[PDB]
Amino acid sequence: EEFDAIKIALASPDMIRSWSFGEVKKPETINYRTFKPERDXXXXXXXXXXXXXXXXXXXXXXXXXXXXXXXXXXXXXXXXXXRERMGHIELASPTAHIWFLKSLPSRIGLLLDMPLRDIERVLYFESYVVIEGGMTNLERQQILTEEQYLDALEEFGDEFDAKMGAEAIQALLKSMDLEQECEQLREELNETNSETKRKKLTKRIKLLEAFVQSGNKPEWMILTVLPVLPPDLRPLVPLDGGRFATSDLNDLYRRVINRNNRLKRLLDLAAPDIIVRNEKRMLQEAVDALLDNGRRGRAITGSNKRPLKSLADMIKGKQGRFRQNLLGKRVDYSGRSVITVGPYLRLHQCGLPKKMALELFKPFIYGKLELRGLATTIKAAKKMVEREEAVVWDILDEVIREHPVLLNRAPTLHRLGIQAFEPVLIEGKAIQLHPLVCAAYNADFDGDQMAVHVPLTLEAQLEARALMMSTNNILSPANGEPIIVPSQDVVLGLYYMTRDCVNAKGEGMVLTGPKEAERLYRSGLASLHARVKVRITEYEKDANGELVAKTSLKDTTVGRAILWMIVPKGLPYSIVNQALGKKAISKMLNTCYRILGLKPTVIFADQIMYTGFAYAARSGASVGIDDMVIPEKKHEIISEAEAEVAEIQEQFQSGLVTAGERYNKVIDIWAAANDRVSKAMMDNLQTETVINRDGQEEKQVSFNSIYMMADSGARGSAAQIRQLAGMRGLMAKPDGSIIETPITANFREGLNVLQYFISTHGARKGLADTALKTANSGYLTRRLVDVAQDLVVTEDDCGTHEGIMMTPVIEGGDVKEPLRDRVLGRVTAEDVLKPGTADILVPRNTLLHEQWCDLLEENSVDAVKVRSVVSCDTDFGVCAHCYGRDLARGHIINKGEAIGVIAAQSIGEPGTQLTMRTFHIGGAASRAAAESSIQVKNKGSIKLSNVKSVVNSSGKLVITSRNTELKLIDEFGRTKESYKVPYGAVLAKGDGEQVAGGETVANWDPHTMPVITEVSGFVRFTDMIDGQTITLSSLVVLDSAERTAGGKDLRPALKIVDAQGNDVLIPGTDMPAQYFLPGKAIVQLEDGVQISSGDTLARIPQESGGTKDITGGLPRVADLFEARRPKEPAILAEISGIVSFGKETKGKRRLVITPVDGSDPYEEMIPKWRQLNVFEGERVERGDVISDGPEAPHDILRLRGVHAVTRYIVNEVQDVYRLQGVKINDKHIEVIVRQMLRKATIVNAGSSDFLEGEQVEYSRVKIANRELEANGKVGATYSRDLLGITKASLATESFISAASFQETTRVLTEAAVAGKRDELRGLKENVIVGRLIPAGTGYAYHQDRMRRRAAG
Amino acid sequence: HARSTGSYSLVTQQPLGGKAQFGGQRFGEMEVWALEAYGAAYTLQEMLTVKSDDVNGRTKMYKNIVDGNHQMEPGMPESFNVLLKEIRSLGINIELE
Amino acid sequence: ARVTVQDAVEKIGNRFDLVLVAARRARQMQVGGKDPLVPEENDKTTVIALREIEEGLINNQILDVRERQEQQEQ
């Protein structure tokens, strides 16, 4: 019996009159000074019985009864209360016409077939348009002028129906016939169809069908009575603390008050043309001017508040209604503390203080004294608390121990920002917080504030107890690895713990297990000693459900023996479990967490921290003047570099060297010299530090704290240390180029004044950038999270056959990531590893053990078909089994989880939170492996995939096609390194040979294209038009975009000729010697110039195709998340068949398409920007790119496919954030792609939805019920174009939601006509309406409770 | 400054903010998406509603503190009634069925 | 105190409704009318409910049969 959503409807006189029923009655209560309101009710003393003006005694004459009652003082009889129901008063009865036509589309304009501006003019104007009639031949909508209305009324006489003002607008809105217009325009546009007809006609037909089947009458658009709110519901937020001032609300109050009151009394009084004209124009501007237009002639211009423009300040405070609802409120129960760090107690617990305690626990203290009975009444307990008795502290502790507290930092990013801890009292005003958790919050101790909230009872305390606990949530659904930061004194302390030293004291020790207590704590045994024979017991978990012990003597240092006592469970026992005390401690933490992720794996794992800060504090590392080491080679390197640069400026003084090459050269010498100072700095960081023992010649490992931080990894970096001792580097914020005045002074040495000047310059620029990235990252999270709201994730496994082929990235010299991490933890349709022997079966899940077994054994196959989230047969929501299994908790996730929605939306936050270096790193570096010299990873046979090998006469090898592939295959067959081989690359060995690590097959200069030819001879320009296409004198061949449309069909090419005139073809190739020149290229040698074998002709100064280099980190992040198609597309092949290019184009798009032969052809032209990759002498299949460059989102979605889209997006994102240092799994990114590819357009016909696109799920239901029905031909295909994906928030099927994320006025205007009910399917709409989110924990009650919707 | 319950405002029934010895500070849209991120429907749904936009949630909540019924009323948000309100002042007025 | 809920997840993995189940048991013991079946570490009835779920003798069917048994006997 619970209500469902709301009802979108219009303003009607019956419902609004129901909201009033009293018309407009009285001020109610106020005006105490006045002493009386309007005072017309029934009483024992009414003095007006049996009539209106008569007495009960029959003596109403003289001075008795009548208007005078029993009390002639104050207190009126009219009140009408204040809050229960929204009232209504007159408030501009005749017209409204405000929020229709307010949006860019005019709704009354399309229903009345009238333009916007003409509606704005004809309102408050004379109107006079005729309405229906049987005696008149004029149209129902036929509009007349004043005089035409006088002659029409005096001529036609009776049966002529028209009204004085807005009534003819009221009367057209009333007289519009939706059925006759629907069938009339339906049969008319269906009988006569045109390209211009479908627009504004067909959509008008379906739109009028939406009006007819909507149920709301257009007559309800206008309001006869306007419902007025009670102040509490009315309330307006004043800017000045609540002042009304001069605003157009007050202007329209002064004009609309007198004009509206005089208009009501005039209309009810049948006023003449003077008062009805002045009151009709003044009131018409009162109701109409507040709606639209008007002149802001308010008080004096300037020095006055004018918070009225579109009258949108009521619906939208700043960006919308967010401030009122759908955004963050002031919450409750908050300490608002500042973080302190407790090292002690438990990873999850709170050093909640006594002062913050008992302030928010007052209800639990009152109920505690009640149930326990130490108090008598609630007031007595209040006295006990206000008196601050000592007994209250004991029961207070009884409550606090197991009553958790949830914690969050105000700038919240990801899901782990809020975590539940078990509070314990600590004396102080602050909260001691676990430092390993501080890195999870990202919070710092610089004094950033803290929001402390108290959960409420069952769902909050226990939900945060079984979910949001910091130990219960370890894994981070962004990187995928468990996020723990045992850095700082844990890395330094474990580094000092695990290490060796020559000689020193103690030598070896026979004692083994308990050698730390007696040996360490007694005397004579250092914390670390090399060559100790102490044995270490081992445990083997390979047995089923049982551990197999073992023991043996291993050489290990005393500190390593101390670290071994931390984890009693099975370990590598000082091999991988000790190492150097580096991030490998986090690695062994991961391997220890790999088995039984609950359990003493979880608990007592903090002993690494207790011993870390314990024996780190015992170590007591320190930094001082002696700590840093200045290399003596610095003087020789700075002097030599200064001498070389002195020779450079001497050559520039002589004029032999240009200023540019001299500047960049000097930059190179100071850069390489700074590298030399860094390397010598490091050399003196390890081998210069010595320890004197006995002869001291052997010395020992360095104990320097700087080296412990650099090698250990607790903090600092080789670059920061390079600034501490070596050169600081060079940068210029205003110029953007490396300065020619380097900093030769170390921090220990006195810096120069100008050095400090440039350093604080660039440092200020760094502060500006790092301060700028926060807002941009926040806005990115705004867009992404606004898109991600749509994930229900309901069905478990729908058994879909579609899955992505999994192949490694294998880019550059070394592979960036292995395929095992991508294929790990993903459902697998087939996924046959090895040469198809057996491998996995069809119905088998991929775990870490099975995927690790197939990855380690028979690794020759790196490609396996794995199901992905983007491809799911589930109609509504996503399938957890198809998406994958992982979470902050253990594996095997369940339904109702946001998954990649919020996990990915929060995953993209840390990547864009900080740029990498100057942000040009994430951009196009313009220098790549295959771009300069193609290199191989593993020794093996290098082959060219999808290419035609063309041998030349010089012995080299060139690719005949445009887009090629160059891969290095090992003896097993697995792909090592594969890069796309572009046309024009001359390689020593095309195929059949081998290559080693770091082998370069071909070398091409990226600055100038060599365009190496084959047969020697004179250069001849082929298909080069002077003055139209193409324009020391050297020719310039530009792109066909700037070429004349007449000669743009042909393309310029360099054709070599012999001395006799005959053409000599290349050996083994049917085509002769020539080179295809792309756009923007420059040809140096002109006609009539002899050339030898392999002579250059033209070079590409710029790429031209997809020209523009790299947008940058922010532009590529907001562009990729923006999902919009590329600026300049290239070409694609939709269907298979004979592919050819022929004929020409005259005054149109160049390069008409000879192909499409076979199945019915269509002539395909184009501007011909990028070079054509496809060959004209061969038949092309479906899905082959006919040109290089970007494939665009639409052509890549309908051509390249979902798989190629996922490859592009995942590869680009993981490369950018990979160079940034953040490795993000494929799952969440493919969820972003899943939400990007939804709402694909639909071409289907016969299902209705004619010619217009609809949702993909609607196509699954329409085609499902289609093939289910006896007619299967009704279903058709659909285009995969993803639009811009930034309007997907506007494309949500829900009503109330996204209205706050978008413009409230525009959403209300556009959707309010469509009249679709929200239905509470939107999650954020549920957040606004108050009913629980049908996901997460509430998915059970929403599924079982919402499962009764079919019953009614 | 620690605060539990305090003065509210006549606008939307939300309290003013800090420095008033009232209010829970603020958990903004980032915390809304943090509860949507943790997947807790309870904390968010009763968050936006019970504390401010709902008097029923506070009255029934404090009444449930006695004997510890522990239930919190989901309620109909009065701030959502400020949105419905403002829309009612707008020329297109929406009414529930 | 309970180290990790993952043990009760090993009992019956859900994690979606375990909030409502353990909140129902901790509701029965917190409101009154129910007694702890586990020796107390001084942990409150909520953690006693977590260990009750870890015991294996409390689940959805036990709350349904026991709830209908108390409703029929009352």
UniProtKB/Swiss-Prot annotation, chain A:
One of its GO terms (cellular component) is membrane. Pfam families: RNA_pol_Rpb1_1, RNA_pol_Rpb1_2, RNA_pol_Rpb1_3, RNA_pol_Rpb1_4, RNA_pol_Rpb1_5. Its EC number is 2.7.7.6. It catalyses: RNA(n) + a ribonucleoside 5'-triphosphate = RNA(n+1) + diphosphate. Mg(2+) binds at D444, D446, D448. Zn(2+) 2 binds at C798, C872, C879, C882. It is an enzyme of class 2 (transferase). Acetylated on several lysine residues in the presence of glucose. Changing N674D: Resistant to antibiotics salinamide A and B. Keywords: Acetylation, Antibiotic resistance, DNA-directed RNA polymerase, Magnesium, Metal-binding, Nucleotidyltransferase, Transcription, Transferase, Zinc. Its cofactor is Mg(2+); Zn(2+). Signal peptide: none annotated. Changing S759A: Resistant to antibiotics salinamide A and B. Co-administration of salinamide and rifampicin or salinamide and myxopyronin suppresses the emergence of resistance to both antibiotics. GO terms for biological process: bacterial-type flagellum assembly; bacterial-type flagellum-dependent cell motility; cell motility; cellular response to cell envelope stress; DNA-templated transcription initiation; intracellular iron ion homeostasis; nitrate assimilation; regulation of DNA-templated transcription elongation. Changing G766 to A/C: Resistant to antibiotics salinamide A and B. The RNAP catalytic core consists of 2 alpha, 1 beta, 1 beta' and 1 omega subunit. When a sigma factor is associated with the core the holoenzyme is formed, which can initiate transcription. The rRNA transcription and antitermination complex (rrnTAC) consists of RNAP, NusA, NusB, NusE (rpsJ), NusG, SubB, ribosomal protein S4, DNA and precursor rRNA; S4 is more flexible than other subunits. Belongs to the RNA polymerase beta' chain family. HAMAP family: RNApol_bact_RpoC. This is DNA-directed RNA polymerase subunit beta'. It comes from Escherichia coli (strain K12).
Swiss-Prot record, chain B:
Co-administration of salinamide and rifampicin or salinamide and myxopyronin suppresses the emergence of resistance to both antibiotics. Acetylated on several lysine residues in the presence of glucose. DNA-dependent RNA polymerase (RNAP) catalyzes the transcription of DNA into RNA using the four ribonucleoside triphosphates as substrates. Resistance to the antibiotics salinamide A, salinamide B, rifampicin, streptolydigin, CBR703, myxopyronin, and lipiarmycin can result from mutations in this protein. The RNAP catalytic core consists of 2 alpha, 1 beta, 1 beta' and 1 omega subunit. When a sigma factor is associated with the core the holoenzyme is formed, which can initiate transcription. The rRNA transcription and antitermination complex (rrnTAC) consists of RNAP, NusA, NusB, NusE (rpsJ), NusG, SubB, ribosomal protein S4, DNA and precursor rRNA; S4 is more flexible than other subunits. In pull-down experiments interacts with CedA. (Microbial infection) Interacts (via flap domain) with Escherichia phage lambda antitermination protein Q; this interaction renders bacterial RNAP resistant to transcription pausing and allows it to read through termination signals. Belongs to the RNA polymerase beta chain family. This is DNA-directed RNA polymerase subunit beta. It comes from Escherichia coli (strain K12).
Curated annotation (Swiss-Prot), chain C:
GO terms for cellular component: cytosol; cytosolic DNA-directed RNA polymerase complex; RNA polymerase complex; transcription elongation factor complex. Keywords: DNA-directed RNA polymerase, Nucleotidyltransferase, Transcription, Transferase. GO terms for biological process: bacterial-type flagellum assembly; bacterial-type flagellum-dependent cell motility; cell motility; cellular response to cell envelope stress; DNA-templated transcription initiation; intracellular iron ion homeostasis; nitrate assimilation; protein-containing complex assembly. It is an enzyme of class 2 (transferase). It comes from the Bacteria. Its EC number is 2.7.7.6. Belongs to the RNA polymerase subunit omega family. The RNAP catalytic core consists of 2 alpha, 1 beta, 1 beta' and 1 omega subunit. When a sigma factor is associated with the core the holoenzyme is formed, which can initiate transcription. The rRNA transcription and antitermination complex (rrnTAC) consists of RNAP, NusA, NusB, NusE (rpsJ), NusG, SubB, ribosomal protein S4, DNA and precursor rRNA; S4 is more flexible than other subunits. This is DNA-directed RNA polymerase subunit omega. It comes from Escherichia coli (strain K12). The lineage of its organism: Bacteria, Pseudomonadati, Pseudomonadota, Gammaproteobacteria, Enterobacterales. The chain holds residues 2 to 75 of 91 of the full protein.
